[PDB]
Amino acid sequence: FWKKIIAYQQKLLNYFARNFYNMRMLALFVAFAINFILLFYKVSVHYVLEESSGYMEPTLRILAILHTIISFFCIIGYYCLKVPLVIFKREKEVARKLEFDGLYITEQPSEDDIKGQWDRLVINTQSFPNNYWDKFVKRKVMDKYGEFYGRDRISELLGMDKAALDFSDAREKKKPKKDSSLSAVLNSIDVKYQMWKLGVVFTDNSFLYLAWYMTMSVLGHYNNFFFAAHLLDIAMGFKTLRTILSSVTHNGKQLVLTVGLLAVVVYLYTVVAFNFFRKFYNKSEDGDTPDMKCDDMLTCYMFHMYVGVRAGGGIGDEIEDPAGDEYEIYRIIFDITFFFFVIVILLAIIQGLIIDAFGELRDQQEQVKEDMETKCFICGIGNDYFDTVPHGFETHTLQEHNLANYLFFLMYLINKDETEHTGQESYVWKMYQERCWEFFPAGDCFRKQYE
Amino acid sequence: TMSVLGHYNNFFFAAHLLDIAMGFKTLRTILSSVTHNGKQLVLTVGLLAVVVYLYTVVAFNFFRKFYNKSEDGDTPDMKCDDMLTCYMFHMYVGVRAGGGIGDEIEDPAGDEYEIYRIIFDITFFFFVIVILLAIIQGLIIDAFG
Amino acid sequence: ELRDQQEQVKEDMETKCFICGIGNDYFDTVPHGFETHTLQEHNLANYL
Amino acid sequence: MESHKHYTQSETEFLLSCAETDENETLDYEEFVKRFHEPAKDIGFNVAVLLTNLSEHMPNDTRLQTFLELAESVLNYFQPFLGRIEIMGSAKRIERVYFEISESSRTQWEKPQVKESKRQFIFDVVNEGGEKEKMELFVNFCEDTIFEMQLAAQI
Amino acid sequence: MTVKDMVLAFFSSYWSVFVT
Ligand SMILES: [Zn+2]
Ligand SMILES: [Zn+2]
What we know:
part of a larger assembly, binds zinc ion, Ryanodine receptor 2 (chain E), 5 chains, 22 helices
């Protein structure tokens, strides 16, 4: 019973993890179809879909149901495909911080970060390094800060205090056989570690996005128009539009600073107009109906920012003809300066900030390619030295200093054993456990070492 | 084939002017600036269509009494009473209007919308015909470089 | 032009020394040689 | 086994004489291969890494080259199975260390997700990555990659 | 009625900065 249901729920979770991106694209296509069939609405205070010979009204409801179901499936497959990686990174970071910096021992975190404060109720749990492919971190930090601080004052906040005492006691002739009772593992599971894990998940950004996605998909049943917000997933989701959207999101601060400077310049022009041009803002309709004047600072500022910016020809085309005496030249200067400073050299800045981003991204890509084609990533010697043997540099970067080979070697060291290492393996493992990395070839290779 | 059809109608000889582009290599320096990205331009027009559809559904759901393009008075037409009609009106008029869409609809002086529709118009302007045509014009300038 | 000026400044600071101006390749024979040379031997802060 | 043109007359008669033929003229080829190939694989990999070490650390030896020509028949089977790293071992000595690379490890490495993550790592390390911590972030990338590879392998 | 009260409600929050 329990075994036959666990071996099935594990298979179901593995399926949901294998089909995360497929369900993502399927949800995108379902949202596309929903928004395509939403193009057949009418008004009557009553929105009605009466635009075809049936087969369009119930299909919308079944498609919304399918979309909500697949959104739930995606939000539960993310928890099985991507959450282990982020919790692994978090555990690795906090464990290495504890070991090499003494965060919760000698260098207590400040209040300007929530991660340092939320990673406090995980160092004192039983299964702290759940995903770090090693469990000898508590022992390392105890041996590092056992004599310089309280031997028990460390294990009181690193957990296992009473547990280590009971283990040292049970090392004698006192050890029973622990029983296993079905349907009673809730006490066995660690609740504090799960609380910390849920706190990390609800802070992860990529999970809040899927939560908002499912929330909008649910509200889509109360109103069949929140399915339009799912088209934003073509931009905030898949990476097929990054080449275009990066040109806008690269500067970002420059664009908002530009629109702020534009607002300030328009406010300067607005106060000048409010103080010196009264008899011009006379947007009357049919005659003798004065309205939309400059008799108010806020009204004149809104009129400027809303009409003179979008007018395409400055502001002198939306106000009266400046033929009046004492202003015939001052208002001409005013209009032409507004034109040349607002819609000529302040929109050129906005359009140039988008064009410079393309060039900057292309330059970054070219620099990456050049650095990968002229030097080695590990030793960094150069192409000219290795280009003495026919096809030397490519053979050096594909056989001698392959990043894939180095990653496979680290994987082999981690997954092979601890007492079966040879001399070189034990040396590299000792260097890696202390995180020094002088075993990487700095500026020498097997070819520079010999003839 | 087109040269033969030119005898049935002496206007298919206009399709032979496309040979100055798809044939000789005297126009490659200019046409490569357009055909270099290619996928970027169609992705840009697709993103523009999606953004205009978002603005269209917002207008259909919150702005009814504005799309009143009546001629001579008391002849309501080209309204937003249909999703497809409003989307076509947007994609056909608001994009080419040169000043956003707030210049082809009624004056937003009505209460409860005086500020929301001003925000709507200015955001349409700044997001569609300012930073979405700048992308199209920058994709052509980057190709030359 | 401004971006090119910034990139040129960064390149001149990352390839040569400000005082002696020898080059990165010569000092890049000892592991992490150029940065140690520009942080210990020829530090502008040290000269000031 | 004789239609593949790989086993000669001697090899065919040897593999036929090495059969169980327990009075029924039937063989459990599962147990047969799990008996005659599992330790052969390990010993052959050890011989292959030994010969590769000798070749790479003793070139220009015709007396060993003629042996490598006849050992190539088995040295090629372990070609996508042995790695080679150049580490700094003894003081000022670039030591070439060898090791085994599992088929699952070399299978989960060619996935498009892992390749794209490696590409992005190289990109954002060449662009804004430093020099004093280049290996520091490279080993972090390696750890994240091997963790996600283990996760994708156990599914 | 929010075309004019919006700026007043936006400035009503900086009274806590004006008091300090
Ligand atoms: Zn190298
Ligand atoms: Zn120097």
